[PDB]
Amino acid sequence: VVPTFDWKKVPVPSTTAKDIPVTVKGATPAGDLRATSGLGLGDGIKNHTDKWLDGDKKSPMEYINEVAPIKVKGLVVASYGSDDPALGCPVEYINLKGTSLENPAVCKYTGNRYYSDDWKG
Amino acid sequence: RGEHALRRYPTGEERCIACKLCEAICPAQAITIEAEEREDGSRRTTRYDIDMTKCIYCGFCQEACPVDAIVEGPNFEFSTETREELLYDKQKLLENGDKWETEIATNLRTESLYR
Amino acid sequence: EFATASADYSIAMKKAAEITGAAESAMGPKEGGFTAGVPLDTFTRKARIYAPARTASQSGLARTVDFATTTPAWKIEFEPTAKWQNPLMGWTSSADPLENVGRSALVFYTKEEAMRFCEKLGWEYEVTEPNKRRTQRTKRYMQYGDNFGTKRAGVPDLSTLPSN
Amino acid sequence: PPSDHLEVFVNEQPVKIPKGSSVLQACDAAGIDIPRFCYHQRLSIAGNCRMCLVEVEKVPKPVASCAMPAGPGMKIKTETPMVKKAREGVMEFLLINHPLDCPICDQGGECDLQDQAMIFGSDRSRFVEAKRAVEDKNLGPLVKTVMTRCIQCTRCVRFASEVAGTAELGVTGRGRDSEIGTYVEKLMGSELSGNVVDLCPVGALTSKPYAFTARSWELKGTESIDVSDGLGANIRVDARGTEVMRILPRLNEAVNEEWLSDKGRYQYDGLKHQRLDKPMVKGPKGLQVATWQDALGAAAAALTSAAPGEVRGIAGKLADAESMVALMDLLRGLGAGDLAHEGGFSDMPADVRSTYTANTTVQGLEQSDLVLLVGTNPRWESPVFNARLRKMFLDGTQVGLVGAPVDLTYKYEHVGSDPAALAALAAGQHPFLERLKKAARPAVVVGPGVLRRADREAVMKAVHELCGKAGVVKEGWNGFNVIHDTASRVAALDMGFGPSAAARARRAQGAQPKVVYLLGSDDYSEEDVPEGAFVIYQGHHGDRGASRANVVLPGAAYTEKSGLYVNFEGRVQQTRAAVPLVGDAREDWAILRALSEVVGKRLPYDSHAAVRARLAGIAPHFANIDAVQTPVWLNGEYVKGVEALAKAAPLQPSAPLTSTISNFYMTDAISRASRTMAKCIQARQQTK
Amino acid sequence: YSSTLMTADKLGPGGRSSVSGITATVFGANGFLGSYIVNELAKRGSQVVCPFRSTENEAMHLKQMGDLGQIVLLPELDIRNDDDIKRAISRSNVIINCVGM
Amino acid sequence: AWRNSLSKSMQELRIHLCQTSAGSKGVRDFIVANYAEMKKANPHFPILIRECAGTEASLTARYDFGAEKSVNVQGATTGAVQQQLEQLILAGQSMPKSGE
Ligand SMILES: NC(=O)C1=CN([C@@H]2O[C@H](COP(=O)(O)OP(=O)(O)OC[C@H]3O[C@@H](n4cnc5c(N)ncnc54)[C@H](OP(=O)(O)O)[C@@H]3O)[C@@H](O)[C@H]2O)C=CC1
Ligand code: SF4
Ligand code: SF4
Numbered sequence A: 001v002v003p004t005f006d007w008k009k010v011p012v013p014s015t016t017a018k019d020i021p022v023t024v025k026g027a028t029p030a031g032d033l034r035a036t037s038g039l040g041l042g043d044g045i046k047n048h049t050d051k052w053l054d055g056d057k058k059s060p061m062e063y064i065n066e067v068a069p070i071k072v073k074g075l076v077v078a079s080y081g082s083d084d085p086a087l088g089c090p091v092e093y094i095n096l097k098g099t100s101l102e103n104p105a106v107c108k109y110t111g112n113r114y115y116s117d118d119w120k121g
Numbered sequence B: 001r002g003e004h005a006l007r008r009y010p011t012g013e014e015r016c017i018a019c020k021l022c023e024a025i026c027p028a029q030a031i032t033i034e035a036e037e038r039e040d041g042s043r044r045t046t047r048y049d050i051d052m053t054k055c056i057y058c059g060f061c062q063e064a065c066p067v068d069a070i071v072e073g074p075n076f077e078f079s080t081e082t083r084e085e086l087l088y089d090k091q092k093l094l095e096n097g098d099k100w101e102t103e104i105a106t107n108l109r110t111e112s113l114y115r
Numbered sequence C: 001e002f003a004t005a006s007a008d009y010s011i012a013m014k015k016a017a018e019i020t021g022a023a024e025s026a027m028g029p030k031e032g033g034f035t036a037g038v039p040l041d042t043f044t045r046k047a048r049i050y051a052p053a054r055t056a057s058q059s060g061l062a063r064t065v066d067f068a069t070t071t072p073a074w075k076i077e078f079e080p081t082a083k084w085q086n087p088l089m090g091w092t093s094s095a096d097p098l099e100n101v102g103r104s105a106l107v108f109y110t111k112e113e114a115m116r117f118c119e120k121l122g123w124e125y126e127v128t129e130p131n132k133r134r135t136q137r138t139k140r141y142m143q144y145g146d147n148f149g150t151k152r153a154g155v156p157d158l159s160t161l162p163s164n
Numbered sequence D: 001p002p003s004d005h006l007e008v009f010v011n012e013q014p015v016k017i018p019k020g021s022s023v024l025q026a027c028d029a030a031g032i033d034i035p036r037f038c039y040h041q042r043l044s045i046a047g048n049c050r051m052c053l054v055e056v057e058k059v060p061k062p063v064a065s066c067a068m069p070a071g072p073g074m075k076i077k078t079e080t081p082m083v084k085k086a087r088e089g090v091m092e093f094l095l096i097n098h099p100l101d102c103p104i105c106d107q108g109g110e111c112d113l114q115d116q117a118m119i120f121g122s123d124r125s126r127f128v129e130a131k132r133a134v135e136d137k138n139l140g141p142l143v144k145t146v147m148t149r150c151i152q153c154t155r156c157v158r159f160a161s162e163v164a165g166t167a168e169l170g171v172t173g174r175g176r177d178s179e180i181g182t183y184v185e186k187l188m189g190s191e192l193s194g195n196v197v198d199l200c201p202v203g204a205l206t207s208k209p210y211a212f213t214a215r216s217w218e219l220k221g222t223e224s225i226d227v228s229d230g231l232g233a234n235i236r237v238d239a240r241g242t243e244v245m246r247i248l249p250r251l252n253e254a255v256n257e258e259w260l261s262d263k264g265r266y267q268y269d270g271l272k273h274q275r276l277d278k279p280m281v282k283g284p285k286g287l288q289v290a291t292w293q294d295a296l297g298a299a300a301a302a303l304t305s306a307a308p309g310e311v312r313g314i315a316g317k318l319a320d321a322e323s324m325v326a327l328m329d330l331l332r333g334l335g336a337g338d339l340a341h342e343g344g345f346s347d348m349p350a351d352v353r354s355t356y357t358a359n360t361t362v363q364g365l366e367q368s369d370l371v372l373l374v375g376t377n378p379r380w381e382s383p384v385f386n387a388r389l390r391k392m393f394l395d396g397t398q399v400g401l402v403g404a405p406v407d408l409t410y411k412y413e414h415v416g417s418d419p420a421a422l423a424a425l426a427a428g429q430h431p432f433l434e435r436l437k438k439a440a441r442p443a444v445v446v447g448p449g450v451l452r453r454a455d456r457e458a459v460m461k462a463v464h465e466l467c468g469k470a471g472v473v474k475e476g477w478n479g480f481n482v483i484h485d486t487a488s489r490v491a492a493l494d495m496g497f498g499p500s501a502a503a504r505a506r507r508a509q510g511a512q513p514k515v516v517y518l519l520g521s522d523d524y525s526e527e528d529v530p531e532g533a534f535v536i537y538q539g540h541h542g543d544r545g546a547s548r549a550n551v552v553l554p555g556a557a558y559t560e561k562s563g564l565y566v567n568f569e570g571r572v573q574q575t576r577a578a579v580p581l582v583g584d585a586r587e588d589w590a591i592l593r594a595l596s597e598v599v600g601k602r603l604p605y606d607s608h609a610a611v612r613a614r615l616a617g618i619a620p621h622f623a624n625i626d627a628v629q630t631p632v633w634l635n636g637e638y639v640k641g642v643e644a645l646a647k648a649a650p651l652q653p654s655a656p657l658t659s660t661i662s663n664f665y666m667t668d669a670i671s672r673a674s675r676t677m678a679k680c681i682q683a684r685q686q687t688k
Numbered sequence E: 001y002s003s004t005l006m007t008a009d010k011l012g013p014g015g016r017s018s019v020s021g022i023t024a025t026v027f028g029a030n031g032f033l034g035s036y037i038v039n040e041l042a043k044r045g046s047q048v049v050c051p052f053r054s055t056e057n058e059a060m061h062l063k064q065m066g067d068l069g070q071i072v073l074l075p076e077l078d079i080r081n082d083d084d085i086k087r088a089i090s091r092s093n094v095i096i097n098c099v100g101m
Numbered sequence F: 001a002w003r004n005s006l007s008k009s010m011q012e013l014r015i016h017l018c019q020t021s022a023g024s025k026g027v028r029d030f031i032v033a034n035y036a037e038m039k040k041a042n043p044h045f046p047i048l049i050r051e052c053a054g055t056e057a058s059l060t061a062r063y064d065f066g067a068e069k070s071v072n073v074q075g076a077t078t079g080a081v082q083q084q085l086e087q088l089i090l091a092g093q094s095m096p097k098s099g100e
């Protein structure tokens, strides 16, 4: 009674299935759904940065990937994006428990990365 | 209040986070914004246009921005020969910010005492 | 006693709408469009008279027909016409003169007022009555005390007690 | 009645309310809209946000108006100094740990917390301590979590327990460290899992496909209908120019209450891919772009060079009534009679509307105390209808099922699985018949998978005998219901879109057409479109039907046109254009009127109002939009009239009564092109 | 090719802001007949490319004739050089010759 | 018998009525007393009974090539609507045929 459904035998068109926008690690699990709008579809552009940057110029995402995560003592960190709090972003409180150098926590305003060796680990 | 410009953090990441507040406050409707999420999960623009022939140079966009991303810089000498040279897209505004960043920071070190 | 928004300037707006001689002004069909001076093909388009429902994202009721006597909520809307993209920038282009005039400026207290405006201007109209909210809750979870009632799993049987 | 309406006083105004109403409902009946965060009309009362605090006379404390019942002669005050101080204090407590996230939050512009802080709160804060920070949770591809913005209203938990039925969310921890979610990494598997994003009053739960793309103030909203199934849920389409940005439900208590399935909510991204925007004619090189005059001429030449008996017209699942009556009149004007429907049972008799519609209606089904489902899976056919069935289950309506056993998120009694079990139920061998015979208002719901069967007439005769014996249809109550799963089927049955007797005979002896008109059909059988035939495809997506065609005529999608659709209860509803036509496409009835002019026999209508008047001339209930007639019931005279169809094609008592929907997330050309639906399927495949 | 030139990319009702789908190169565009032809094409929403040999003052009247980005001006045209002719027609599906003496 | 003839003269028959009106009483009586016998003679003939509140009682015959004729039968008796159906049968012989 109530037989299980086999999802693996469900057909998906190959044009649709190969065009899913997904994410690299960053602020999500790697490989989850990436939100997109219609801009760039007529020109065949499936990438975020290519929609406004032209050439082999260094992207902002490649700039922030070169800054290493920062070791912070404690359980919560406050992120302003600047030494002066008037000159940065609104303050962001980022959880640091469960974080390491390999899996750090990222600020949603600045893209800076933080971790703590204080959660008994 | 001179030529509009888009700014970065000292790391090189954009300050703008596509909140669309500067587009909402603009009385001339001189700003057009589209956005989606970047491949690392960040919230960033894919289009940021400023029609400089529609702009009134009020500075309200500079006031509405919560992350100091859009500014009006100290440049007033930017007359062109074609009108298509005055429809700025996102790349040119970032190029303006990369040109004028040190002067903008020097100005904002004084004007942050008042704002 | 009578107190229906009796502390603001809307008292001085409800009267001045019922001043004698001016409360009985009336025109024939399509006559107000002849004296409006706008092109006559504008009145060949179709209009919709409707009160927009509450947005799903929020719980407040202020922009609904619940507060119909307090606030004008009925709208006049027109069908869309062609849009395309600008080749140089990508901006959305249009040739529609009635693209935002019904959604920004024309608001009415009742359905019949919007109908009267459409009739004297010459617009052909369709009227859409909004869907009425239901306030009565379900039989289960009718009150807060039904969360903890005996309807969860019945009356408990006292057969596992010591001495049975 | 012993004064079933009691009188209370709200700000010294007398208000009559029904008995059992709370203080908040009495305030709502007085024209006052009390601020709230945890109360919902469709959920159970919680009473934990403390925002609805009002003052009642002879009570020294503020009462929670959502939970407190209203007594006789009660005096409620909503604008005293203690009420305003209470509102400001509760708002200040709500905002001390909230993150400064309004620029990056998607609720900014349509946020209950923002607007209630602006109106009922203060303008300052005195809090300079560090805030609470929470890690985010993974709940699948449709729900995005930023859990630092949670305000612990527990609307999500109550929704998942009460409406969705899955009951997978909970509150773990205690105190300030209370934390919403699943303890282990799990995926939200409900079909109604996008509704919790609407139910969350803050940006803790937002829509992942929609994320960071638009603000709510930029969107032009259009009230339309949903065509992804046969219920016709009422929706609002939000567009920015030519692009549809999101789809939301809107209230209709007779149809969908406030809900919408995930397919109807998230399939809009298929409207940006594989779109037909130009007419094409197949040349020696293949299909290539042609003018409208050339494409109409080629279609007319193929339609006129063939004999009238070699022409077949197939309607799709999403064709509106105007285009269907246009194609029907155009093909009948040429002397053809071969009409087919992509949704199956094209030869089904459509003489009385009560035999293929839900006579009880959707809201009238709630007055039934016992429900018998025959051969249907309502969770995959219409999840909003199945949610209303669960709502009926929660307040006492018992459910039995004859069919293949399925997960329905409520307990049911499995009477059987085949028409042999149906005959045993009608005779009296199963004790569920005595449960039906003693019920005050029994109901029978027959699904579309029964009507797709080759022996559907014998099964319907057995169902009619069961309804006659169990008192399902009597004076004052009609409990016989037939539901559908396709948007265009009931309108085609209403107008008479069916093949003639000669065409049915020619299909019986195996005649094959040479010209096929595909009105938006992409799930046709291979028996109906022969190889080497001339195919005219009229539609909006490039799919199986357009890759095979010789002439392609681009039409409108349901977000671009205003066409009529009838749901399975008989209610006439209409779409509305939220965006203009794409490219060089046209209106769908207009293509057929132009094609009838190029053929040589014009259709007698030149406007949208005129083709709607033609529809009202065929069946007069088409003119009454947003309403449903009471259909005529002819007792057993109709079943006596079609006994020849019962004698021929006899009963198959061993084939199980199943549901034909095997792919819920991809049912038509729009949902097959949606990348979000493909990610939804991939998420259920990677969990094994 | 046949009538796909005037129908396939036509966007808008046909005014100054609309799109006709025609990219045209007019040689001798600053002349007597060429100016009227360039005005006729550009007012319906076509992109017009205009190479010229003369000074810019004698070609400035062509700048007004179309919307932003749709009149393209290429000075210092040498018709004995094939590179100028190749650059001027590199995006056009219509070529109109008004060069004469 | 007229019932057996009601598959060759016309391609379809449409009956319009109101559920509760006084003028649609004879049509409703005719349908109740005659639908089973008119459908038993030919099981594949489409007889579209369609109802709406407050409409006029009407019979409609659809012939070949999309042709259609209508007769108003409001206030008529069962014998009268039977008669009007019979003259709807009679005009079907002088119509052009299709299918072949
Ligand atoms: N009634 C008429 O005028 C008739 C005209 N025609 C033809 O129609 C065309 C338009 O004539 P119309 O406009 O009246 O004459 P114009 O002299 O006004 O136009 C000739 C154009 O060709 C350009 N041109 C001439 N020689 C050269 C060269 N060696 N290199 C580059 N560009 C050159 C000129 O540019 P620049 O300003 O630099 O000289 C000028 O813009 C002509 O070619 C003519 O043969 C045909 C029949 C009748
Ligand atoms: S300075 Fe004024 S006109 Fe210019 S972009 Fe800002 S708000 Fe708009
Ligand atoms: S520039 Fe500033 S205000 Fe404008 S969208 Fe970006 S972050 Fe928002």
Ligand code: SF4
Binding pocket: D098, D099, D100, D101, D102, D103, D105, D106, D107, D108, D109, D111, D112, D113, D114, D149, D201, D202, D203, D204
């Ligand atoms: S939920 Fe989002 S938009 Fe609302 S107040 Fe919090 S951060 Fe701002």
Ligand code: SF4
Binding pocket: D149, D150, D151, D152, D153, D154, D155, D156, D157, D180, D199, D200, D201, D202, D204, D205
């Ligand atoms: S996630 Fe949203 S609905 Fe759930 S408890 Fe938090 S605020 Fe309430």
Ligand code: FES
Binding pocket: D035, D036, D037, D038, D039, D046, D047, D048, D049, D050, D051, D052, D064, D065, D066, D067
């Ligand atoms: S709405 Fe009553 S306590 Fe939350």
